Amino acid sequence: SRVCQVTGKGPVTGNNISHAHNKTRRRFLPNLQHHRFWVESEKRFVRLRVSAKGMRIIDKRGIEAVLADLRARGEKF
Template identity: 60%
Template structure:
């Protein structure tokens, strides 16, 4: 399963880890993804989402109905 937030679209960031000896190795910064179940009153059912913590803040701010409506317009399946 890919590490992408369904609400915000956040993906892993890529870069180099630099040691004390300045040897570089590849690494990636994962988004803080959580599995959450939200009740959507407009649809009368629960929706299970894989969202970042930033996405949870977006849902708290704008409401789950508005966020789900926007996600369906983008074509996100859940």
């Protein structure tokens, strides 16, 4: 679904307050892209549907450590 494979961010619900303060029920989607992360210690790209601050966690912790606890949770790649 629309969940980040790194952060676990899914869609959130909320309102659409107008000028006359009418509430319309909407949904907050996360900023998901697909992206191919290069892994040196496998010599292989892994393509990963990830939110855009899930890539900030790749850039901070390394893909070799984020993939360590994607498979601890037991996901695709």
